[PDB]
Write a protein that binds this DNA or RNA. Structure first.
Ligand SMILES: [Zn+2]
Lengths: 137, 57, 76, 38, 97, 142
RNA sequence: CCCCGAAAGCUAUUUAGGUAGCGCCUCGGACGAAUACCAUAGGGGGUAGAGCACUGUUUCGGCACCGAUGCAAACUCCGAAUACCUAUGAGUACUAUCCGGGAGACAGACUGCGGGUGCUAACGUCCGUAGUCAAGAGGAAAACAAUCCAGACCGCCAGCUAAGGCCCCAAAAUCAUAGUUAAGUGGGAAACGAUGUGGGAAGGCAUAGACAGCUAUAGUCGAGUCGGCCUGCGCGGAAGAUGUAACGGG
């Protein structure tokens, strides 16, 4: 369950998720990677579930690079509570995802095994993904 | 030296400056045609409301 | 019950006379909390860093000096 | 017969067919692999 | 001499955001050619040929020929822009060599 | 008062006979409704019935396209609770072919006393014979 | 009977459904280009975007530092479009300003755009900004204040158009030329599933004989065959209570 060790502020504005992921869309650490093709939110539990699935499939024979970190807190009201009376309490952490953002990379396994692991992990995610490989430019 | 401009759409719900551009060109109603000097100052007003005028150049 | 809910009254800072305008002696040019702009020729500085004109003329902004400070002056 | 939103081939003796606009899977070896999408 | 890209001149009326989007809707790719002792020249490439060439690995380390009309330029690829989500090439840079 | 209305006492109703063998139901019904209302006459008047008499023969030979022969549904409600009755084109054309034409043309005629009067001029028969030889209908190929 | 025509805001209030000053309406007088729209010229910015130079935060290596790699309303080495201020100028327009008599109003609503809050719920709530209603009829939306087109001085059995339409209810094309769909899709919905069909760019094997079937890699036969990528339109996923009832009907 990834989460920042400490934060400068506790609660943040909702914001709007727009635009494409020009940064963080290039394979840098491994040889094969999975990237999102539509935008959304990615929770820490989702990140952990996908990582566990990939590691279990590849039997820890390679290295998995996680390139998403959930540094955005999300609040909810305590339930049965009326509107107003201040902002709600922090409940979980998410990472904003834009189309093109790379989520996981794998180093040191066969392409077939890596693609099987990525197909297994894609079923755990709330958005559509695709598979990319390292290229010269 | 002069061009003819015709109003082709209603101006009732347009922006304030767009209505003022129509008035400063002298157009008063749909189908009205006026003849104005061809100067950059007039061209600015015409271009701002391009979407509801027709220019016989 | 929230512990927040306070704020102060507005202070209405900012540039009052822009470049190219003509001023009379005594006119306030810039209201500022600190010296974002510095006083050039014919411009005086008040106790709260307000910049005002000390002569009649035209206001001009510039960037000058070895520190790259912003200056505003009055040309007679 | 299994009724699922997702129907797929299980082994090498399964066949995917369409009857009256319905996708079905029929297996020659194992009757328990028989599927119908719905 | 092994790699040859047939191109067309990309004029001022074909430069800009809207013109580039129209070109890419036509399945064409904008590119620029710059390098010592001559002014830059803007050209239009075919997406099909660009993808075919990029599939080869020796294309990134070999002198290639961009041919527009009768003019011929000997260049090496310098930079490429891809779509963040679709990986389609969108613009090319070529340094004279 | 220069535009004149047609007078009911001066209207002439003419008799026509139409064969339904192989025709598409709706594309026949539109023409039947037009001629029943009198839209084809230069004395057309909205409040006056100026149309003609239409005799449809071979009613059970009418056709529908696609899969409508099995899928097109005809509903009615007896006003008792749960009294919704349902049938389809395949059964209805075999059982009561005239009701299909009655529904199709009634849906295209005006809804009121004048429409009720207009639809009385259409005679539908399943066989190839009609009992109106005395009126000497003319063959109308619509 | 004729002319003009608001507001539901700010500030304060034992004030909050009241009232007062200001903002907005009207009438009289004074004074005329001092006003506005647009063009050109001068000017400050720290938002959108972006970035890691500070403040925080993040991953992987090497030895707090070095190399790669992300994030930010209360971070900034940078940084627009618009908006705002000033001067000059053409054309168009009853504009601007000052002094007085009379007010009403200080419960707003929806929609688009930028946001806070809420669950990126609510015909929810609170701001900024524009339009409409309020105080506005007509036409199109089946019916439908707030959407689209358009601003009704009176009369006409005259004509042209806007939005939207032209088989019948019901005015106008059963108009013309190319394709696609077979689901009544059109005329409600997701992850996901599948040899449904149209188009496109590549790749593999093959008449010194390919794929399938068939006989013990060889052999009968006699041309195409195979597996992926992009894309148009379709299919399943899809259960509710009065009666078809999710094209207004035919
Ligand atoms: Zn099986």
């Amino acid at each position: 369950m990834l989460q920042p060790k400490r934060t400068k502020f506790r609660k943040v504005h909702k914001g709007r998720n727009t635009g494409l992921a020009h940064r963080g869309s290039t394979v840098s650490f491994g040889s094969i990677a999975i990237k999102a093709t539509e935008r959304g939110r990615m929770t820490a539990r989702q990140i952990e579930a996908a990582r566990r699935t990939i590691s279990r499939r590849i039997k820890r024979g390679g290295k998995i690079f996680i390139r998403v970190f959930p540094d955005k807190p999300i609040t909810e009201k305590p339930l049965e509570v009326r509107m107003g009376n201040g902002k709600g309490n922090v409940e979980y952490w998410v990472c904003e995802i834009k189309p093109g953002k790379i989520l996981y990379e794998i180093e040191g396994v066969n392409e077939d095994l890596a693609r099987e692991a990525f197909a297994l992990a894609a079923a755990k995610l709330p958005f559509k993904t695709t598979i990319v490989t390292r290229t010269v430019m | 030296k002069t061009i003819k401009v015709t109003q082709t759409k209603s101006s009732s719900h347009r922006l304030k400056n767009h209505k003022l551009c129509l008035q400063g060109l002298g157009l008063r109603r749909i189908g009205h045609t006026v003849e104005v000097q061809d100067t950059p100052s007039n061209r600015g007003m015409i271009n701002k409301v391009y979407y509801m005028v027709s220019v016989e150049e | 019950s929230t512990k927040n809910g306070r704020d102060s009254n507005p202070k209405m800072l900012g540039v009052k006379v822009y470049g190219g305008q003509t001023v009379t002696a005594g006119n306030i040019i810039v209201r500022q909390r600190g010296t974002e702009f510095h006083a050039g020729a014919n411009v005086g500085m008040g106790r709260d860093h307000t910049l005002f004109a000390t002569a009649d003329g035209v206001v001009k902004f510039e960037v000058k000096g070895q520190f790259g400070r912003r200056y505003v002056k009055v040309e007679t | 017969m299994k009724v699922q939103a997702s129907v797929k081939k299980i082994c090498g003796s399964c066949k995917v067919i369409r009857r009256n606009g319905v996708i079905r899977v029929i297996c020659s070896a194992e009757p328990r692999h028989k599927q119908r999408q719905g | 001499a092994n790699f040859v890209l047939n191109a067309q001149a990309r004029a001022e009326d074909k430069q800009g955001k809207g013109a580039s989007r129209r070109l890419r809707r036509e399945s064409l790719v904008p590119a620029i050619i710059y390098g010592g002792n001559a002014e830059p020249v803007a050209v239009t490439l075919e997406l099909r040929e660009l993808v075919k060439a990029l599939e080869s690995n020796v294309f990134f380390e070999e002198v290639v020929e961009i041919k527009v009309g009768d003019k011929v330029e000997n260049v090496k690829i310098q930079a490429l822009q891809r779509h963040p989500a679709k990986n389609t090439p969108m613009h090319a840079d070529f340094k004279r060599a | 008062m220069k535009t004149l209305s047609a007078k009911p006492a001066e209207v002439q109703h003419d008799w026509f006979v139409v064969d339904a063998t192989g025709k598409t139901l709706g594309r026949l019904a539109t023409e039947i409704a037009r001629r029943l209302r009198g839209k084809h006459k230069t004395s057309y008047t909205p409040h006056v019935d100026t149309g003609d008499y239409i005799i449809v023969i071979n009613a059970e030979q009418v056709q529908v396209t696609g899969n409508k022969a099995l899928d097109k549904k005809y509903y009615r409600h007896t006003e008792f609770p749960g009294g919704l009755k349902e049938t389809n084109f395949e059964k209805l054309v075999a059982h009561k072919p005239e009701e299909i034409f009655e529904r199709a043309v009634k849906g295209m005629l005006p809804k009121g006393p004048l429409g009720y009067a207009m639809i009385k001029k259409m005679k539908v028969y399943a066989g190839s014979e009609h009992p109106h030889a005395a009126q000497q209908p003319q063959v109308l190929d619509i």
